[PDB]
Amino acid sequence: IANQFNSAIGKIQDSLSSTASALGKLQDVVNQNAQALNTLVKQLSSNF
Amino acid sequence: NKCVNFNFNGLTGTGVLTESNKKFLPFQQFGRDIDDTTDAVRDPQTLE
Amino acid sequence: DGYFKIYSKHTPINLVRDLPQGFSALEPLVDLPIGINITRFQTLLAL
Numbered sequence: 001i002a003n004q005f006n007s008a009i010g011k012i013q014d015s016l017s018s019t020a021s022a023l024g025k026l027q028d029v030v031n032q033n034a035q036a037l038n039t040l041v042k043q044l045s046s047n048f
Numbered sequence: 049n050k051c052v053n054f055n056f057n058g059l060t061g062t063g064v065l066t067e068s069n070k071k072f073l074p075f076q077q078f079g080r081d082i083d084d085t086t087d088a089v090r091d092p093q094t095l096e
Numbered sequence: 097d098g099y100f101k102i103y104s105k106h107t108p109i110n111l112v113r114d115l116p117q118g119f120s121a122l123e124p125l126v127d128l129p130i131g132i133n134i135t136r137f138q139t140l141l142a143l
């Protein structure tokens with residue numbers, strides 16, 4: 001049970017080291033807030 | 049290095065003026081930020 | 097709009113018969129206060 005647990009915590013390092021995509025739901029929140037501020041600043045350049 | 053009302057050629061606003069590391073080519077007279085706002089200026093009486 | 101705009105570039109090559117691969121923008125070289133209508137053009141080569 002300890003070797004299976006130690007091996008599984010092993011794979012958590014391998015997943016969180018290897019891919020970029022595993023943290024997608026946090027990066028999506030950071031991206032949406034950055035995209036809304038990019039929009040808000042771009043509207044200052046609009047003539048109306 | 050002091051807050052100033054600047055008026056370059058009628059391009060006008062308030063800011064602190066600081067020496068650029070921006071290499072403006074001989075044709076360039078204003079600089080523009082990602083925000084689409086003026087962020088650097090070539091002085092009209094000395095080419096700095 | 098009564099201007100004529102010239103952009104240009106100069107580059108070293110080693111090539112026998114084509115327009116070369118790669119990318120490089122043309123800086124503005126001169127602008128002229130021309131005013132004229134244009135509809136065709138010609139080039140001058142040395143004899």
Ligand SMILES: *[C@@H]1O[C@H](CO)[C@@H](O)[C@H](O)[C@H]1NC(C)=O
Nearest residue numbers: 077090091092093094095096
């Ligand atoms: C502004 O005047 C000074 C003194 O005549 C001169 O050194 C300077 O080059 C002038 N600026 C330009 C753009 O020539």
